[PDB]
Amino acid sequence: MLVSSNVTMQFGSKPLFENISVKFGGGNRYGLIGANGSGKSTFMKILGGDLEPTLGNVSLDPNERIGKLRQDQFAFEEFTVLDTVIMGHKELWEVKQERDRIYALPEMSEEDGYKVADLEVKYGEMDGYSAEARAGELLLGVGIPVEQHYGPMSEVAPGWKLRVLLAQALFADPDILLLDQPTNNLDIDTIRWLEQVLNERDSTMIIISHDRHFLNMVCTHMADLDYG
Amino acid sequence: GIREKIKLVSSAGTGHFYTTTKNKRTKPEKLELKKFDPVVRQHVIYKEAK
Amino acid sequence: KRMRVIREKVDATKQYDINEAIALLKELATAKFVESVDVAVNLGIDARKSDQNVRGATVLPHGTGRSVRVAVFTQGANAEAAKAAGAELVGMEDLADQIKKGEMNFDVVIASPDAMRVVGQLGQVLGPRGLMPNPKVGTVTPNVAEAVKNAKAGQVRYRNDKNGIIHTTIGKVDFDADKLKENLEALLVALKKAKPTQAKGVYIKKVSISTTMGAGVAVD
Amino acid sequence: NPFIRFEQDKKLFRNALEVEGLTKGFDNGPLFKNLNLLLEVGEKLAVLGTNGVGKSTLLKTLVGDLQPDSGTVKWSENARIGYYAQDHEYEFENDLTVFEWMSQWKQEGDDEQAVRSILGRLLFSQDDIKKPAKVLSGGEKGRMLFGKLMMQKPNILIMDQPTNHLDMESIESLNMALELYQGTLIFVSHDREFVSSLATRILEITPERVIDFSGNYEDYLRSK
RNA sequence: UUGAGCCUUGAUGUGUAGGAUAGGUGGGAGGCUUUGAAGUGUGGACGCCAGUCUGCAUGGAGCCGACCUUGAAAUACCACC
Numbered sequence: 158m159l160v161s162s163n164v165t166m167q168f169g170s171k172p173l174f175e176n177i178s179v180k181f182g183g184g185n186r187y188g189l190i191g192a193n194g195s196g197k198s199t200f201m202k203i204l205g206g207d208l209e210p211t212l213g214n215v216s217l218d219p220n221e222r223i224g225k226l227r228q229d230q231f232a233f234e235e236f237t238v239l240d241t242v243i244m245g246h247k248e249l250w251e252v253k254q255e256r257d258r259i260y261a262l263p264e265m266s267e268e269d270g271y272k273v274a275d276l277e278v279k280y281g282e283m284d285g286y287s288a289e290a291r292a293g294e295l296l297l298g299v300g301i302p303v304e305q306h307y308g309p310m311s312e313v314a315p316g317w318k319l320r321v322l323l324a325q326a327l328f329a330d331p332d333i334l335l336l337d338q339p340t341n342n343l344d345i346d347t348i349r350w351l352e353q354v355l356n357e358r359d360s361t362m363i364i365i366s367h368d369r370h371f372l373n374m375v376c377t378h379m380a381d382l383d384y385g
Numbered sequence: 386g387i388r389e390k391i392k393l394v395s396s397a398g399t400g401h402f403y404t405t406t407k408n409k410r411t412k413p414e415k416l417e418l419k420k421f422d423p424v425v426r427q428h429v430i431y432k433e434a435k
Numbered sequence: 436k437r438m439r440v441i442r443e444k445v446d447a448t449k450q451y452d453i454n455e456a457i458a459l460l461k462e463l464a465t466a467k468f469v470e471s472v473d474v475a476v477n478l479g480i481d482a483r484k485s486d487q488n489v490r491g492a493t494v495l496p497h498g499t500g501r502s503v504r505v506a507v508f509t510q511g512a513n514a515e516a517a518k519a520a521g522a523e524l525v526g527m528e529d530l531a532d533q534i535k536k537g538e539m540n541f542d543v544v545i546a547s548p549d550a551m552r553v554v555g556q557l558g559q560v561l562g563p564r565g566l567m568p569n570p571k572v573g574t575v576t577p578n579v580a581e582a583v584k585n586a587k588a589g590q591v592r593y594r595n596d597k598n599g600i601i602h603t604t605i606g607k608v609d610f611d612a613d614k615l616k617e618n619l620e621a622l623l624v625a626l627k628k629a630k631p632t633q634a635k636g637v638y639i640k641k642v643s644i645s646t647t648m649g650a651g652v653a654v655d
Numbered sequence: 656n657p658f659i660r661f662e663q664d665k666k667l668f669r670n671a672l673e674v675e676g677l678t679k680g681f682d683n684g685p686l687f688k689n690l691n692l693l694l695e696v697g698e699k700l701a702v703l704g705t706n707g708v709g710k711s712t713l714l715k716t717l718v719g720d721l722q723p724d725s726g727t728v729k730w731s732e733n734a735r736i737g738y739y740a741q742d743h744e745y746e747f748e749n750d751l752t753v754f755e756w757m758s759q760w761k762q763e764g765d766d767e768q769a770v771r772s773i774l775g776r777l778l779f780s781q782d783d784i785k786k787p788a789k790v791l792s793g794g795e796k797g798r799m800l801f802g803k804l805m806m807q808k809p810n811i812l813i814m815d816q817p818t819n820h821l822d823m824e825s826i827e828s829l830n831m832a833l834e835l836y837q838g839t840l841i842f843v844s845h846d847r848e849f850v851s852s853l854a855t856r857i858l859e860i861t862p863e864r865v866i867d868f869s870g871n872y873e874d875y876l877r878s879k
Numbered sequence: 880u881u882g883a884g885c886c887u888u889g890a891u892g893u894g895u896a897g898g899a900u901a902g903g904u905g906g907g908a909g910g911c912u913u914u915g916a917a918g919u920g921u922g923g924a925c926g927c928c929a930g931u932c933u934g935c936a937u938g939g940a941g942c943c944g945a946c947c948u949u950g951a952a953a954u955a956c957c958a959c960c
């Protein structure tokens with residue numbers, strides 16, 4: 158249950174919103190609605206923690222593993238498909254890159270033996286062994302092939318780049334903030350697939366999808382960020 | 386009325402705040418002023434925060 | 436057959452005692468085997484949170500009833516300690532790249548801070564089943580040969596489940612009731628001392644003792 | 656509801672493209688073979704397809720960002736082409752504010768009115784016209800592109816996907832403007848009741864067979 | 880009748896690599912099989928229809944575990960969830 162405490166964000170003369178205090182959480186699934194240019198795209202950044210409000214706090218739970226994504230896919234064309242699908246589980250990634258300092262670091266000290274001994278323990282404890290299997294399951298379930306795996310970020314259609322970058326969010330991650338699922342208009346079939354998997358798998362999600370029928374299918378609570 | 390009250394908290398870690406007014410709609414910018422901090426008795430930075 | 440006779444010969448709804456439980460477990464003896472009797476404590480821990488995970492290794496006074504092929508993966512002093520205490524794996528990445536690659540697997544891996552190439556050589560080969568040297572259990576320790584020797588004495592290891600449970604062999608059923616009782620007491624004391632500090636509520640709810648082919652009964 | 660109405664500086668009479676052949680396939684088998692069609696100053700031609708059929712690259716080769724491997728396109732020499740590209744991030748860069756951005760366009764206009772008024776007519780304010788145009792998001796950027804189109808008053812609008820991020824209340828304004836538009840346009844918007852609202856000259860692309868003018872899209876989607 | 884909690888019995892649980900709708904806990908590669916078996920004949924129940932499950936004599940005593948395609952191991956399996 159991430160709770161907002163008097164959140165208020167201002168850009169220039171008129172604030173986007175004032176005195177926002179809602180207890181987001183439970184077991185239900187939320188989605189918020191608002192005219193573009195009014196919050197929505199700033200509220201979720203505030204919730205994630207990428208941008209603190211002019212007044213208010215986020216009061217995140219300590220280990221509920223908030224799940225964020227890099228939404229727009231026309232601005233990071235450098236990090237390849239595998240690159241961007243490997244970079245959700247922050248603890249898993251950091252322990253992986255700290256354990257990779259064995260084939261990299263030419264030697265070790267006595268303390269570093271204990272370091273790597275507990276590093277592989279933590280590796281196993283968040284299941285870095287099956288991490289590749291789960292990532293591949295998501296990657297080939299959205300619909301990209303093994304052939305397009307190591308290909309660059311740019312030279313694939315965004316209709317599949319949404320498919321690949323969604324896999325960065327569903328790393329067994331409860332309490333995900335999924336931004337616009339429409340835009341780069343999907344093929345309705347893929348929208349339906351996402352709707353079904355989201356309705357099946359259990360978590361708390363916050364969505365800013367703009368499609369009435371898609372929201373009708375998926376979400377359960379509706380946050381109207383309209384007046385103030 | 387339009388000018389709203391704020392407070393400048395100290396960045397020395399001590400609890401000592403100056404208080405002042407600020408026109409809340411020009412642009413929201415945390416005031417950055419070096420002011421005397423009598424608890425530590427030295428000039429430090431006072432980032433505004435209410 | 437065995438299910439449909441044991442579900443009426445033994446009832447698990449009612450609780451048992453440490454005296455009659457061992458008698459019943461040795462009375463089952465359904466199949467021709469050693470039948471290493473096992474215990475299962477339903478720990479109370481928020482295993483969803485990392486800090487409440489309980490990993491440990493205790494030294495029971497009556498052995499693990501098996502053979503410990505403790506490879507002393509420690510070049511130099513670790514290798515000498517393995518030679519002194521019967522190390523079936525010299526400390527070097529060769530025993531994990533050529534001998535280990537061709538070989539099936541080792542029993543335990545006693546780590547050393549001098550020559551531990553297995554820290555990246557083992558990977559998913561010998562660590563998938565839980566054969567890596569755990570620093571919290573003492574794998575990365577000043578003594579490699581000493582740890583290998585202690586392992587043969589009955590250095591059993593436990594790690595909690597996803598749902599906060601710890602099951603592990605308590606001993607071979609060939610052992611006596613007194614031996615089983617004292618081993619269980621030692622294991623319970625070790626787990627009690629190894630409980631995490633930020634663990635609210637009662638953390639020991641159920642204890643079950645079961646036979647590899649027979650049933651299991653609630654010992655408390 | 657913003658008030659957008661694209662006008663026309665000069666009227667085209669005979670036709671626009673008269674395209675014959677492109678032979679454009681990036682690396683694999685060409686997604687389209689012949690594609691010989693005209694416009695006679697027609698309208699709409701809502702290209703549709705699945706995720707990965709080639710509408711945007713066809714539009715790019717049509718405008719001039721890319722060129723066909725073999726063939727030619729050629730526009731009418733008096734035409735004026737407005738382009739709402741599929742990606743609009745290469746435009747919003749170089750730290751230009753809203754006012755400077757929408758003033759960098761215009762042919763013969765005043766730098767205080769018709770550039771600061773074309774902004775106010777679409778949900779923008781005095782505060783808005785001074786913030787940098789790069790930090791805008793989504794529907795604001797789309798409306799900025801629509802403002803650039805209105806300012807340029809072009810004959811032919813290419814308008815890859817206009818309904819991307821819009822408010823569904825700006826969608827109605829866009830539909831009103833498009834119906835009232837007396838010029839020429841193509842577009843590949845995938846929305847159903849957008850092509851159903853305006854399109855009449857469908858150009859359905861598909862890797863092996865391409866459809867040209869089945870009808871008013873209702874005979875199309877009722878046959879298929 | 881219909882909601883909720885609790886206990887018990889017994890059911891229930893795929894990918895992508897392919898033998899097969901392959902939850903972990905790992906303790907074990909030798910147990911399971913005639914206190915009547917492989918499959919035959921006949922019905923259930925469920926189901927991304929390829930397939931799991933159960934009354935059932937008979938038929939009359941083999942299927943398996945490995946090897947293996949693997950992130951994992953295979954309802955040999957006994958417990959606790």
Ligand SMILES: Nc1ncnc2c1ncn2[C@@H]1O[C@H](COP(=O)(O)OP(=O)(O)OP(=O)(O)O)[C@@H](O)[C@H]1O
Nearest residue numbers: 168192193194195196197198199790791792793794
């Ligand atoms: N860094 C910034 N500096 C100044 N103004 C900003 C900044 N970031 C956003 N804004 C403005 O603040 C307002 C809030 O828009 P925001 O991006 O939060 O909305 P959104 O809900 O994500 O948009 P959309 O309608 O496209 O879905 C907009 O007017 C935007 O231009």
Ligand SMILES: Nc1ncnc2c1ncn2[C@@H]1O[C@H](COP(=O)(O)OP(=O)(O)OP(=O)(O)O)[C@@H](O)[C@H]1O
Nearest residue numbers: 312313314316704705706707708709710711712741
């Ligand atoms: N750079 C590229 N590399 C590989 N294939 C490409 C590239 N650009 C386009 N394509 C192919 O061309 C097809 C049609 O192009 P386009 O991007 O318009 O497809 P679309 O998915 O229908 O459109 P959009 O998603 O942009 O609304 C795509 O389906 C894709 O397979």
Ligand code: NA
Nearest residue numbers: 197198792793
């Ligand atoms: Na947005």
Ligand code: NA
Nearest residue numbers: 709710711843
């Ligand atoms: Na396109």
